[PDB]
Design a protein around this ligand. Structure first.
Ligand SMILES: Cc1ccc2[nH]cc(C[C@H](N)C(=O)O)c2c1
Ligand SMILES: Cc1ccc2[nH]cc(C[C@H](N)C(=O)O)c2c1
Ligand SMILES: Cc1ccc2[nH]cc(C[C@H](N)C(=O)O)c2c1
Ligand SMILES: Cc1ccc2[nH]cc(C[C@H](N)C(=O)O)c2c1
Ligand SMILES: Cc1ccc2[nH]cc(C[C@H](N)C(=O)O)c2c1
Ligand SMILES: Cc1ccc2[nH]cc(C[C@H](N)C(=O)O)c2c1
Ligand SMILES: Cc1ccc2[nH]cc(C[C@H](N)C(=O)O)c2c1
Lengths: 106, 106
């Protein structure tokens, strides 16, 4: 098989990913997102995404310490730091939107 | 830490997952789904979801052989069979919706 690092494989994985994104958009529009995501993801993957969202929310809120976050979520420090790095790599427009969504939800 | 198999951890992972699902719904509504998903997933995870969607589409279409599907997607037979099993475990309403979405897209 080909290298996973080739441009060709990058293009293939990029186009297939966007097909998934569009199918999930349509599932949300028809209220089928939950069964689609149970089809397309494993339990561990859904668990990881739940953990990651809580890490994002608590890092942006700034109220909990890393120690408290580790205990509350059962996620190690390395995972929390990867989440902080991932936030910093994301566009400012997304980070600000997330902050605003959280602010209003209080 | 607690067992990953306890009811308590199942409930925690279930509630955190649903928080992710709702945040992603809101991202789609604001056209921020692509940056949110780049934040929340790795490249390999996006690659896997693209591969899985193509497996679903080609299994439902029934036109390609498993051999052809393996070659086209660079996914082994074990992954294709896991996809077939995953389809069969999913609700009929979802499987039929996917078939109908594909039919119309032709
Ligand atoms: C053709 C090729 C050349 C370079 C490569 N770097 C990684 C891989 C994937 C895996 N190691 C394999 O051997 O398939 C690979 C493949
Ligand atoms: C089929 C394919 C496509 C994506 C992949 N991500 C990691 C791998 C394994 C590879 N041997 C490596 O670790 O570089 C790999 C292979
Ligand atoms: C959190 C998450 C989200 C969705 C995912 N799809 C695949 C994976 C990991 C898997 N072992 C792979 O990379 O093929 C994964 C993980
Ligand atoms: C919030 C958070 C917490 C831990 C995480 N582990 C992997 C990811 C995905 C990230 N976009 C990446 O490619 O590493 C991630 C995100
Ligand atoms: C408390 C407890 C009891 C039963 C368990 N089955 C799996 C685990 C997780 C891991 N093996 C660990 O040792 O944390 C675990 C933990
Ligand atoms: C933190 C936590 C929560 C979810 C998990 N899925 C797998 C594991 C590893 C564990 N030792 C096992 O393989 O049963 C694990 C642990
Ligand atoms: C279409 C397809 C192809 C291969 C796959 N590997 C893992 C999954 C997710 C599935 N819901 C599960 O829990 O195994 C999956 C889905």
């Amino acid at each position: 098989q080909q290298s996973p690092y080739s441009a060709a494989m990058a293009e293939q994985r990029h186009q297939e990913w966007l097909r998934f994104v569009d199918l999930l958009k349509n599932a949300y529009q028809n209220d089928l997102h939950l069964p689609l995501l149970n089809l397309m993801l494993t339990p561990d993957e859904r668990e990881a995404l739940g953990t990651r969202v809580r890490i994002v929310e608590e890092l942006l809120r700034g109220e909990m310490s890393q120690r408290e976050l580790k205990n509350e979520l059962g996620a190690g420090i390395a995972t929390i730091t990867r989440g902080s790095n991932s936030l910093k790599a994301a566009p400012v427009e997304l980070r600000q939107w997330l902050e605003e969504v959280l602010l209003k939800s209080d």
